[PDB]
Every structure is written in C-alpha cells, then in structure tokens.
Paper text:
We determine that SYCP3 is a tetrameric protein and that its helical core folds in an elongated rod-like structure spanning 20 nm in length. We conclude that concurrent DNA-binding and higher order assembly by SYCP3 on meiotic chromosomes lead to compaction and organisation of the chromosome axis, in a manner conducive to SC central region assembly, recombination and crossover formation.
The crystals contain two tetramers in the asymmetric unit; the tetramers are almost identical both between and within iodide derivative and native structures. The overall architecture of SYCP3 is an extended rod-like structure that spans approximately 20 nm in length. The helical chains of the SYCP3 tetramer are arranged in an alternating anti-parallel fashion, such that each end of the tetramer contains two N-termini and two C-termini. The SYCP3 structure undergoes a left-handed 90° rotation along its length so that the two N-termini at each end of the tetramer lie in orthogonal planes. The two halves of the structure (hereafter referred to as arms) are formed of a four-helix bundle leading into a coiled-coil that zips together the C-terminal parallel chains, leaving the N-terminal ends to splay apart. The most prominent structural feature driving the tetrameric assembly of SYCP3 chains is the presence of two four-helix bundles, one in each arm of the tetramer. The centre of the SYCP3 tetramer is intrinsically asymmetrical as parallel chains B and D interact in a coiled-coil, keeping chains A and C apart by steric exclusion. Instead, the central region likely oscillates between two conformations, in which the coiled-coil encompasses either chains B and D or chains A and C. In both conformations, the left-handed 90° rotation would be retained; interchange between conformations would require a transitory super-helical unwinding of the central region.
Author numbering:
A (entry chain E): 82 to 224
B (entry chain F): 81 to 224
C (entry chain G): 70 to 221
D (entry chain H): 82 to 221
Write the structure that this text describes.
C-alpha cells in the first residue's frame, strides 16, 4: 500500500509535468502570432512615418520658395510701376515743351511785327523822298 | 500860264502819291501773306499734336489698367499655389491622424483579445486536467 | 481450482479492453471539443481584426477618392489660369507695340513740322524777292512818267 | 538835248542806287527775323531730340521688365503643375503602401491559422501518448 501510493504519486507528477509542457507549447503559438502581428504593424508604421516626414519637409520647402517668389515679385512690380510713371511724366514733359515752343513762336511774332512796321515806315519815307527828288529836279520852274 | 504849270504839277503830285500808296500796299500784302502762312502751319501741326497727345493719354490709361490686371493675375496665381500647399498640409494631417487611429484601434483590440484568450486558455487547461484526472481515477488500482 | 482463477483472468482482460476502448473514445471526443472551443476564440478574434481592417479601408478609400477628385479640379483651375493669362499676355504685348508706334509717329510729325517751317522760309524768301522786283519796276515806270511829262 | 539826257541819266542812276539800298535794308530786317525764327527752332529741336532719345531708351527698359514679370508668371505655372504631379505620385505611393499593409495582414492570418492547427494536432498527439502511458502503467 506504501508502494501503491508511491506509484500513484509518480504518475500524478508526470501528468502534471506533461500538461504543463503541452500547454506552454500552445501558449508559445499565441505569443508568436502576437509578435508577428506587432512586427508587421511596426514595419508599416516606420514606412508610413518616413512618407509623412518627407511630405512635411517638402511642404516646408514649398513654403520657403513661395517667400522667395513674393520678394522677387515685390521688387519687379515696383520697377514696372516706376517705368510706367516715368513714361507718363515724359508725355507731360513733351506736351509742356510743345506748348512752350508754340508760345515762344507767338512772342517772337509780336516782337517781329513791331520791328517790321518800323522798318516798313522808314522804307516808305525813303521812297517818298526819292519821288519828291525826281519831281523837284525835273519840274519846270515858275515864270 | 503859271496857273496851267501849277495844275500840271498838282496832277503829277496826286498820281505819285497814288502810285506810292499802291506799290507800298502790295509789299504790305507780302508781309501779311507770310504771317498768315506761318500761323496756318502752326495751327495745322498744333491740331495734329493735340490729337496725338489726347490719344496717347487714353492709351496710357488703358496700359495702366492692363498692367494692374496682369499683376493681380500673378497675385491670384500665388493665392492658388499657397492654398494648394495649405490644403496638402491639412490632407497630410488627416491621413496621418487616420493612420494613428487605425494603429490605436488595433492595439485596443489586442488588449481585449488578450483578456478573452487568457480566460479561454484557463478553461481549456481545466478541461485537459479534468480529462487526465478521469483517466487516472478510472484506470488506477484501489487501496486494499 | 487453478483453471477457475485462469478463467477469471480472461473475464478480467475482456473488462480491461472494454474500459480502455471507452476511455479512448471519451478522450478523442474531449480533445476534439476542447480544441474546437479554442479554435472558435481564434476565429472570433480574427473576425474582429478583419472587421476593423474593412472599416478603416473604407475610410482610407474615401480619403484617396476625394484627393483624386480634388487633383482633377486643380488641373481644371490650372487650365483656366493659363487661358486667362494667354489672353492678357496678347492684349499686353499689343499695347506695347502701339506705344512704340506712337513714339515713331510723334518723332516723325516733329521732324515734318521743322522741315515744313524750313521749306516755308525758302518760299517766303522768293515771295519777298518777287515783290521787291515788282516794286522796283513800278518805281522805274513812275519815274519814266514824271520825266516824260515834265518835259512836255 | 545833251543836257536833258545827262540829267535823265543822273536821275536814273540815283533812283537805281536808292531802290537797291532801301530794298536791301528791308531784306536785312527779313533775314534777321528769319535768323531768330531758325535759332528758336534749333533750340527746341535739341530739347525734343533729347526727350525722344530718352523715351526710346525708357521703352526698351519697360519692354525688358514686362518680359521679366511675364517670365516669372510662366515659371509659377510650371511649379503649380509639378505640384499637382508630385501630389498624384504621393497619393499613389500612400494608396499602394496601404493596400500592401492590408494584404500582408490577410496573408499573416492564413499563416497563423496553420500554426494553430499544427499546434492543436501536436497537443492531441501529446495527450494520446500521455493517456496510453497512464493506461499501461496502472495495469503493470
């Protein structure tokens, strides 16, 4: 009976050990599956993170280049506006110079008119004197 | 005799006066003609220059209007370029957030599943232990 | 008497075989059931992971479809910007050609004006010469008349 | 009659000289006035020539600057275009990576199904051996 109980205890210990091992092997299958699902998620998350980081950097570069264009345009828009302003001033200058030219010609005409009248009056006196000389030197004297 | 001589003299003097008056008037008409032609020429060109200046002023008014349209067009194009960048950044944020939500939902599901699996595994262990205990008790030699 | 104990032994071995067969049948059935229950937990978990994937895939598909449509609209906007610019670029280059012509026109009219004044001066020189010569013929005729008539 | 002809010739010579002198003095007034009109034209022509030259140069620079703005616009139309192309590629890349991810998870599910089946079958063999051992040893 001591032998009987020793045999029973031996079989019970072996059963306990066998169940423990068989269950642990199944537990390792769950852990493997879980490891592989997490590994797959980590691999794709790294790839998505790389894409999102590259996209964010490209948007930062695009913002930087917009700033460069705005500055370039600001400068060129000022030069273009000034070149139009100068042309409008040029038109005003030519119109004013033309009016000045016409006015100078009118002032000169008035001066010339008065000088010509004086010269014409002298010419008339000279011609009258010439005819008076001819008349007096040819005319028959009174008897 | 002297009355006749003086009448002849008076006649010649009147003719001389009339001739000088006419000859001088003809020269005076040359001055007036020259003056007329110079003024006519100035008036003709002034009218032409005025037409050109008026047309030029209107064309400068149109050129300023069109210059404003093309600069506005560039500024409007910049608005489109800037907006498309802003929308892209929003899109990136939306996709990034949806991806993080997906990963988080999978992690939450894993935690729920872990607890459910532990419970099921414990029941399985009890059933296997019960099965082996049944085999042992039904086969074993009884105490004497 | 020994034959009896031996005959008892056969009935013992028959009983032993029957007991073993019964336990083997029960074990087979129990392992099958216990494994099936675990398999169902696995299938449930797998169903819920697939359901989650299907739900997110639908949401990602919506985002990608909306993005594709927005790129089609952006291509439409880009085409209108070009077309409005092409029209405006033509009007602007035409304006600049006209103002170039205006400078040429004014420069030519100015040169024509100066040349006309020079030509008029030359014509006026001939009108004065002609008038002075006519005056010189009239004075000679007048003197001839006075001379001839004062001798009479 | 010799005296009469001498007198006439003297008066004719004087008249010719007087008309010549009087006309020359008027001609000089005319030439002076003409000189002053010609001088005035030359002064203004110099000023107009300067303005026209400067205007021509300013129109050359205005043409070049307009060209720069039109060029700047054309360069941005290319950037807005290359923005649309890069976006479409980016969308394609993300969409493909997402589909790959979903497909990989489906493939993993199928592999995991086989790992569980295999483990369950090994477990069944282990329990059968264990029962056989208990049975054989409880009789001996």
């Amino acid at each position: 009976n001591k032998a009987l109980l020793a045999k029973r205890k031996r079989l019970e210990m072996y059963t306990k050990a066998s169940l423990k091992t068989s269950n642990q092997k199944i537990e390792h299958v769950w852990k493997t599956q879980q490891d592989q699902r997490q590994k797959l998620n980590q691999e794709y998350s790294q790839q998505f993170l790389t894409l999102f980081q590259q996209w964010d950097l490209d948007m930062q570069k695009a913002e930087e280049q917009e700033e460069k264009i705005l500055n370039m345009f600001r400068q060129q828009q000022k030069i273009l506006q000034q070149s139009r302003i100068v042309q409008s001033q040029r038109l005003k200058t030519i119109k004013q110079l033309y009016e000045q030219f016409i006015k100078s010609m009118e002032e000169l005409e008035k001066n010339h008119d008065n000088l010509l009248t004086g010269a014409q009056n002298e010419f008339k006196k000279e011609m009258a004197m010439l005819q008076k000389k001819i008349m007096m030197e040819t005319q028959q004297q009174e008897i």
